[PDB]
């Protein structure tokens, strides 16, 4: 049984034993982590998800120019979180934030579970007026995208993505099976 708005009980990291750090380390990008902390079924194949993203060290908001979720398969392909040009100020810490948005999840794992469609998070530090803080920037690459997924890894257990992929129950039907 399905009811619109139902929360999924069991959000599954689909590849928790991959090394996701290697991909950031190789690019001189500070490590970040991502977890999918909530999933609920809206209707049809649309789910509302909440992510929590944390950076290894704290980076003050003053250093940030823009931050957006990109490559989303969902009602909106781009989710703006911060940006001066975009006049959007929804997060106050680019190294400890949450975001909530909708995805269309359609690629089934099995008869009960469906994959999160993968996406990226685009960070732009030290651009525009934030460039004034270059003298104290200490965290490596300033302009980068971090990607999710379990579908792209090497033969030595390193992901070529930065964050795991996830799956959950179709329609958040928590008693499927």
Q: How far is the CB of 119 from Mg ion (least distance, A)?
A: 4
Specify burial of residue 10 (Cβ count, 10 A radius: 0-12, 13-18, 19+): exposed
Position 110 contacts Na ion (CB under 5 A)? yes
Instruction: Give the single-character DSSP code of 16.
Output: T
**Residues 78-117 close enough to bind Mg ion by CB under 5 A:** 117
State yes or no: residue 11 binds Mg ion (CB under 5 A). Answer: no
**Minimum Å distance from CB 99 to Na ion?**
10
Q: Which of 39, 119, 41 is nearest to 78 (CA)?
A: 119
DSSP letter, residue 61: G
**CA neighbours within 13 Å on the CB side: how many for 141?**
16
Q: Contacting Na ion (CB under 5 A), which of 6, 38, 73, 98?
A: 38
**Binders of Mg ion: how many residues, by CB under 5 A?**
4
Our CB check for Mg ion shows the closer of 12 and 30 to be 12
The dihedral region occupied by 157, where left means phi > 0, alpha psi between -120 and 50, and beta the remainder, is: left
- What is the binding site for Mg ion (CB under 5 A)? 72-73, 117, 119
Q: Contact positions toward Na ion, by CB under 5 A?
A: 15, 17-18, 38, 43-44, 48, 50, 89, 92, 100, 110-111, 122, 143, 145
């Amino acid at each position: 049984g399905s009811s619109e708005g139902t929360s999924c009980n069991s959000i599954v990291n689909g590849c928790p034993n991959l090394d996701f750090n290697w991909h950031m380390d190789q690019q001189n990008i500070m490590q970040y982590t991502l977890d999918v902390t909530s999933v609920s079924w809206v209707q049809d194949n649309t789910y509302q998800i909440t992510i929590h993203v944390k950076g290894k060290e704290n980076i003050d908001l003053k250093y940030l120019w823009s931050l957006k979720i990109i490559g989303v398969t969902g009602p909106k392909g781009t989710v703006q979180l911060y940006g001066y040009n975009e006049n959007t100020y929804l997060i106050d810490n680019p190294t400890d934030f949450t975001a909530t948005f909708e995805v269309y999840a359609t690629q089934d794992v099995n008869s009960c579970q469906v994959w999160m469609p993968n996406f990226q998070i685009q960070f732009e530090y030290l651009q525009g007026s934030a460039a004034q803080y270059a003298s104290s920037w200490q965290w490596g690459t300033t302009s980068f995208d971090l990607s999710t997924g379990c579908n792209n890894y090497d033969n030595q257990g390193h992901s070529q993505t930065d964050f795991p992929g996830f799956y959950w129950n179709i329609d958040c039907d928590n008693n499927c099976g």
